[PDB]
Each structure stands twice: as C-alpha cells, then as structure tokens.
Amino acid sequence: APAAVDWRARGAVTAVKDQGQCGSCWAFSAIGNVECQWFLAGHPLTNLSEQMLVSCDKTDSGCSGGLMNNAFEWIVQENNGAVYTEDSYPYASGEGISPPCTTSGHTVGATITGHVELPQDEAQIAAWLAVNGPVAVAVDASSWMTYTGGVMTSCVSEQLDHGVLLVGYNDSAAVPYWIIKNSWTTQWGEEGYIRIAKGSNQCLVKEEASSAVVG
Question: Coiled-coil annotation: which residues?
Fold first, then answer.
C-alpha cells in the first residue's frame, strides 16, 4: 500500500490453472477474482468453478470467448449470486468444447452481490488493489507466447484479446511492475505468472479493469 503489494504472499491467491484448448480465459479471470475477493471478505480460500461460467453463462460464448463484466452479472442476475466449488463442478472443457450446463449436483462455494468497473488509470487501479485485493483485467496478449521470464519492458498494445488477474505491483523495483496470474499452466512464464512494466499502459492493462463485490 503504496510501495509494493503481492497478494500471493498474503495467502489470497489459488494455484495456477489450465484453460486448455478452450477460449475460456474470460472465465478464469472472473473466477480468479471471485476466489480472492471471497478470501478477503473473511472466508477460507476456496477453489471455485470456471466450468460453471463456460457451460451455463449464456450471455457469454463458452469456448469462443466472453467478457468478465458479463460473467459477473450473469452470476448475480441468473444464478442467484452463486459460484460453485471447482471440486463440485470440475473443469471439463480442456479439449475445446463446453459440455451442457447442469444446474444441480454442485455445492455453492462463494456468493457475490455485484461488480465495480475501475478507472482507466494505473495509479488508481493500484490504489484500489492495494486495499481491496486482486483485479480482473483485459490485456493484449499478442507478445505473451514468447514470454520466458523477467519484467517485460515493452509489450504489443493494439487489441484486447485476453483476460487475466492482477495480483500485485512493486513500485520499488528498478522498473515498477505489475504481477499477473495467467491460465496457461505453471510451465509458462514465471511459474504461470508474468510481470510487465507499470505506468505506461503496457499491453493495454488499464483499459478494462473490474472486480466482483461480495457482501
């Protein structure tokens, strides 16, 4: 809160997952944000279900893409605020297809009441994150298949195409950076994470930032 915040070092972030061949990054961003906000609201960190969104959220398009803001509003407006545990609705879309939605046989792991859309300003996003926790963001991920580690100091920043989770920042480093959880397994990047320079809208990170509200 200023200087540096890393919510992974606060017990607030679950393990890196794998979206597989499904274009479900929107769902991993939205659920990763809910997992962290649920913990920060005073509940034990629980793994929650991306499959629930890929299969049941009909305001988004399953393995053909979606938006974290639509995903948050589908949970509130159509699923009575419920987010199921990952254990009770496991990921089933690794091959690139979303099975039909099942409405029963699952357990509620978290509930949310709404969502807030954050200012398109990195200093303001950092100020909110420092106090309220991890933020879902959309980025241009064109450069990211060649990311091998370290702080990426220049990033292609043309078109938003990927949704991820901002878990921290460090303004004390040589080049200030953001720390981001991705969904392409631990074999990619720094054990599934990436750091990009902060303060110059690298990869269009300030453009579409939002968070679920629980309470």
Answer: none
